[PDB]
Point group: D2
């Protein structure tokens, strides 16, 4: 992709936001990977929308890309696990443990064991290391603080956290400039689909 | 929204497709509601991606908007129900029946009863009216044929089924026209974010 | 089985009751089929122990033995079904409907349909015929009244509802009589396993 | 209970067996606790009827009565757990782990952890200590061999493993002796419920 084409994506991101095509905005952010929307990410973490959180992240990094990315996915999936335990859904917890968390076992065998053993407690706060889990809301906020620091320090997000400053409706402005150009060819002085003409 | 702004969405739809931002394309189709992609819809129906099918439809119509829309959602949810029965998941079938299909009971009480009673059969092909359900693949294709006819006849889709014919990369062309205009102001004759200048 | 052997079972039923071998009592009642314990049956119905209720009944009658027996099992399984609905366990309800209640469909097609359709209600008291279901406790008591009348009128229970009047510990008394007989052979005048002897 | 009354139970156990009241036999064995039927226990272990196995055992010992009893229940519940894993029912396995196996954690913390961690394997034979689990049939037979040795060495089963040798139908014989005694009072020389008389 050209630098031109990349900039055009940013102009479109701005346009879509101004037109309040909100889901389209975040899909384009994700598929192009040119811009990671922190506020959007924070929103989804607070709402516990873990599926969308990972889907969004997937446009920017894989779990094993580097150590920051690994800890990011580990923290998210671990919170997902603990929340399952908290609602007494041990069936879901084990599912999460095997499908989402097992990839981390290689990197730290004994931590995975420690986390596995939480399954068998009446309340996993009986483990002193997990006695710090307060409620869902507070534990998400605490974790989010850590997630932000990991993302901001993650080299794969290096130039993707600040939106280019531009004047409002920059795309619309360029379009109007093209219309003026189309007219600056016409003697004797419609649509965007085909050029404007005069006799 | 202006006719200008609407046309700009179409230019963006073309650009996104050319850049192979496929999910963004269909999200913009859905959120703007300006264009319904039949081929995309066919693909998702054949794949049995019922959640995405309804989500996509939701940008164009509600279940109770008119009779065509009602039959469209009824046919989709009924196929979803029958497929649940076919894999012997009666728990899921009842869920579908109560959550997705019950809204249709008012409009036809006895058909809903008929469909409900399929739950109790060893094989719902024991009902002669449903003896026509062959396998999943063939039943999806048959239904799709009907879905297309309902959509094409649905007044809410009237001008949304044919993409405007335009030359490739129309957005990119307008952008280049703006660049030429920015230069047609410069004595003595960079970026898209701010205007190009010469001394 | 002889009339002797049958009477011996009754003597054993009395002994087991006196020794408070309560589960053994009801197992012997069931396996021999000589006596149906109404009070025990009432207890299990009030407690909603449907599995044991049917197991106990199974020693005395099959579901299709006659019309009384059929209505007895129908009423029990229908209550089991309604209770599942009441606790919002539609998965269990459908299971009951297909496994336990379907055998009754042949005998009354439209009643089974009526009962099936209760699945789809938010509250099955929306059906006027089932608007009479109050709470679990009261509905069990009402049904029990009907179950008793069906059992008492059921020809297969004809001579099995009243325990033979006998003096307490009749078995123990006969045993002591045998011991006296064993001694009424001994010059010159231990265990039950072998005869008592004197030199 | 007298030694008389205890012997009478054995006479009844014999009678019930001779009359093929099989479930009553094992219920009386269990409730009286006077005799533990090894062959019956073997049968139920081979059939994997774990609920009935524990119910039967419950008449003779509690899990924490002594070390033999503890190992007996541990081995049974562990096999139940492994079988759940084998059929890929991790939901059931966790249930067993928390409800049935947790009581053993106090006595051996690290073995319980080891067993817990089997949940997360694709195949729990990946653990070298559990690489010995062959198939269900063979693992039940192996375990049964150990269960027998534990039961035979368990002081609570000391005099409960061998049935008293007696002649067939000993109860029936004593009954006939009582009938003869009832007649050895009659000038001038029916039922078991009341004494036999002549004018
Ligand atoms: Zn012009
Ligand atoms: Zn210039
Ligand atoms: Zn004597
Ligand atoms: Zn006599």
């Amino acid at each position: 992709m050209s630098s031109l084409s990349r900039e055009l994506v940013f102009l479109i991101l701005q346009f879509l936001d101004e037109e309040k095509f909100k889901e389209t905005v975040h899909k384009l952010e994700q598929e192009s990977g040119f811009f990671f929307n922190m506020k959007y990410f924070e929103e989804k973490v607070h709402a516990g929308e873990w599926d969308e959180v990972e889907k969004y992240l997937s446009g920017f990094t894989k779990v094993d890309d580097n150590r920051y990315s690994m800890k990011i996915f580990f923290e998210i999936r671990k919170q997902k696990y603990l929340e399952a335990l908290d609602r007494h859904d041990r069936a879901k917890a084990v599912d999460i443990l095997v499908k989402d968390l097992k990839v981390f076992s290689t990197f730290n065998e004994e931590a995975y064991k420690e986390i596995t053993q939480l399954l068998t407690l009446e309340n996993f706060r009986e483990n002193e290391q997990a006695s710090k889990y307060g409620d869902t809301k507070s534990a998400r906020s605490i974790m989010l603080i850590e997630l932000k620091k990991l993302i901001e320090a993650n080299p794969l997000f290096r130039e993707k956290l600040v939106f280019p400053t531009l004047k409002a409706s920059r795309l619309r402005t360029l379009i109007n400039q093209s219309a003026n150009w189309q007219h600056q060819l016409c003697k004797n002085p419609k649509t965007l689909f085909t050029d404007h003409t005069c006799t």
